[PDB]
């Protein structure tokens, strides 16, 4: 009724998932005027997310993705050029527009071995955030983080959804190869994987072998690694629609 119409209303926000939205609509939580006058009720990332909610609806062109992206790359080098960050998402593919900006981050002193390394992203959040780029935190652990950004203007823009997520370098392109490609084109590179003995996750990809689920993760020093290994000639980001 107008009570499953004002939880699909809540679920837009941020943070409010289908669970916390019902029980705020039984709290008479209804319409973007009433959360605005209960902020009391809601959690951080929901209070963040209520407070851009016009501007999280709104899509990012290109242009500004490109933009956004020469602060992170050109922040991250300054800090340490031996940091490798990659924004990804269709973008990566040549998207003329996206819906945020997803980024992995990476360390050669941060390992799978390693594991244990907050401040590696930290220091990243950190740098941003002085610079005025990243302007609010969701939430923040100790490999990932989900926040808030926006560029810079001498009047301006609007807020933008991104997050960044530190991944052991030895496990870094496998991740950069998940985030990218497509649903559709991770789907049709791992069932090729498997056709010619290899099994690919976000992670890894290892051999399989007879009887089955099998496995020892070989090195990968790059996306053209994992194509090798499948013998799949290279596909460029952008001719992975599938």
Request: glycine letters at 6%.
């Amino acid at each position: 009724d107008d009570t499953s119409s004002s939880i699909n209303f809540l679920t837009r926000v941020t943070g409010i998932g289908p669970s916390a939205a019902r029980k705020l609509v039984d709290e008479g939580i209804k319409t973007l005027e009433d959360l605005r006058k209960n902020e009391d009720k809601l959690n951080h990332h929901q209070r963040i997310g209520l407070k851009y909610f016009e501007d999280f609806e709104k899509r990012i062109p290109r242009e500004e993705m490109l933009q956004m992206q020469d602060i992170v790359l050109n922040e991250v080098k300054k800090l340490d050029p031996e940091y490798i960050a990659t924004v990804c998402g269709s973008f990566r593919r040549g998207a003329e527009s996206s819906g945020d900006m997803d980024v992995l981050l990476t360390h050669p002193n941060f390992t799978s071995e390693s594991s244990k390394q907050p401040k590696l992203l930290h220091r990243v959040v950190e740098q941003l955030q002085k610079v005025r780029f990243i302007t609010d935190t969701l939430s923040k652990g100790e490999t990932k983080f989900m926040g808030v950004c926006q560029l810079p203007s001498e009047n301006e823009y609007p807020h933008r959804r991104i997050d960044i997520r530190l991944i052991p370098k030895d496990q870094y392109y496998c991740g950069v190869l998940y985030f990218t490609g497509s649903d559709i084109f991770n789907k049709n590179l791992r069932a090729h994987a498997l056709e010619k003995g290899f099994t690919i996750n976000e992670y890894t990809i290892r051999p399989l072998g007879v009887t089955g689920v099998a496995g020892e993760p070989l090195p990968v020093d790059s996306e053209q690694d994992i194509f090798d290994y499948i013998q799949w000639r290279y596909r460029e980001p952008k001719d992975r629609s599938e």
